[PDB]
């Protein structure tokens, strides 16, 4: 688990799929999902070393877990720790979108951030930490009880 409650993140690079403001906005909103139900606070930084580095990359990208082209694996993230720990990577060969029509960035980022914070997967198809991606209505997006129980048992 992170052994602090103030956690920074940095966006390493941007996908050409979406407007930058939409990337910023999806990432910022995905952190809010988790800071709304825990005592964690997340700050974006623009220089220096962040706890959570957000990367868009294709294929092999230097961490011994290469991506696989369009389809299959969408993204992955490392559990809490220094260095690469916490970092969240998105497969650039996906087509990242603000709504539907590709792979939704916001929803995928919520799921990945859950792993950066120390969460495993849920057996609840309504949970964001469910292992399978589906587009759900963002307007009615809510964490499930199982998400809330898991994050709260790590962080309060
Ligand atoms: C054991 C298993 O899950 N096998 C399937 C296998 O069933 C599937 O056919 C294959 C396709 O290549 O992907 C395999 N797969 C998927 C994954 C999970 N993926 C990663 C992850 O959990 O974050 C990992 C790489 C870290 S993942 O597939 O990339 C992934 C990423 C995000 C989500 C998600 C969930 C809820 C909301 C929004 C997005 C779902 C899946 N791992 N292995
Ligand atoms: Ca890190
Ligand atoms: Ca892929
Ligand atoms: Ca892409
Ligand atoms: Zn990676
Ligand atoms: Zn997962």
Swiss-Prot record:
Summarize where Zn(2+) 1 binds, as residue positions.
Answer: 61, 63, 76, 89
Residue positions annotated to bind Zn(2+) 2 are 111, 115, 121
Annotated binding of Ca(2+) 2, by residue:
51, 83, 85, 87
Family statement: Belongs to the peptidase M10A family.
Q: What does the protein in this record do? A: May be involved in tissue injury and remodeling. Has significant elastolytic activity. Can accept large and small amino acids at the P1' site, but has a preference for leucine. Aromatic or hydrophobic residues are preferred at the P1 site, with small hydrophobic residues (preferably alanine) occupying P3.
Cellular compartments annotated = Secreted, Extracellular space, Extracellular matrix
Residue positions of the active site: 112
Q: What is this protein called?
A: Macrophage metalloelastase
Q: Relay the domain remarks.
A: The conserved cysteine present in the cysteine-switch motif binds the catalytic zinc ion, thus inhibiting the enzyme. The dissociation of the cysteine from the zinc ion upon the activation-peptide release activates the enzyme.
Identify the coding gene. Answer: MMP12
Region of the whole protein represented? 108 to 263 of 470
Tissue-level expression reads:
Found in alveolar macrophages but not in peripheral blood monocytes.
